[PDB]
Amino acid sequence: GGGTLFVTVQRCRNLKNKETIGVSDPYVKLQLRKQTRKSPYISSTLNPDFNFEAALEVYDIRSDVLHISILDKNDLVKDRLMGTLRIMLSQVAAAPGDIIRGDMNLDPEGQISLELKLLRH
Ligand SMILES: [Ca+2]
Ligand SMILES: [Ca+2]
Ligand SMILES: [Cl-]
Ligand SMILES: [Cl-]
Ligand SMILES: [Cl-]
Ligand SMILES: [Cl-]
Ligand code: NA
């Protein structure tokens, strides 16, 4: 393998509310091997428009996995998990143009609009 994965999270829709009182304040967390990224949060919404851009280095295209989490930012208690999605880098590498772009289903509910572009080295 070996490449750079460009990730754009455009938005999420229909997220599961996790806030004890009020509406959750979502942000994106990305993880690939030892790399982590976190977007700024958006207050009081289950339908955030993030337009979040990141890049992660890929060390083995065949086996690497990108882990996406959507979390509720909290000030006093632990941030709570709203939804997750795993992307296998092999799926990106198989796609025409090494590009994937669509509205995907989060676990356990909600949708996420993403663009994933792999540049191979
Ligand atoms: Ca809130
Ligand atoms: Ca919160
Ligand atoms: Cl890993
Ligand atoms: Cl922020
Ligand atoms: Cl980044
Ligand atoms: Cl998943
Ligand atoms: Na998009």
Side-chain angles (χ1 to χ4, degrees):
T4 300
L5 178 70
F6 296 101
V7 182
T8 298
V9 181
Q10 166 182 65
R11 75 194 198 169
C12 294
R13 294 291 183 261
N14 301 307
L15 295 173
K16 195 172 193 320
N17 192 35
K18 292 294 177 141
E19 196 84 270
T20 296
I21 297 154
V23 184
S24 290
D25 315 289
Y27 65 97
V28 182
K29 173 178 176 188
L30 304 175
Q31 169 123 50
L32 194 159
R33 292 196 176 212
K34 294 287 206 181
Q35 301 166 84
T36 299
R37 310 289 185 259
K38 290 185 201 164
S39 77
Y41 73 89
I42 300 184
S43 185
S44 322
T45 184
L46 306 175
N47 294 288
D49 292 336
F50 286 119
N51 301 131
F52 173 54
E53 301 279 358
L56 290 137
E57 197 69 2
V58 175
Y59 293 100
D60 185 40
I61 286 166
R62 304 200 264 130
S63 63
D64 275 340
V65 170
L66 173 64
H67 298 278
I68 307 176
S69 303
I70 310 295
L71 289 123
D72 182 358
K73 174 72 199 309
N74 297 328
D75 293 321
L76 302 174
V77 298
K78 183 174 182 270
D79 292 358
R80 289 187 197 138
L81 191 54
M82 307 174 75
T84 62
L85 173 68
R86 67 182 152 170
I87 299 293
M88 278 56 207
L89 269 292
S90 58
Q91 183 178 47
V92 188
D98 294 344
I99 279 302
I100 298 181
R101 174 178 220 261
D103 294 339
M104 291 179 87
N105 302 307
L106 294 164
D107 176 351
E109 53 193 81
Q111 297 82 46
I112 179 169
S113 302
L114 48 66
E115 192 203 291
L116 307 162
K117 175 175 132 220
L118 172 69
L119 181 78
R120 297 160 193 261
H121 303 323

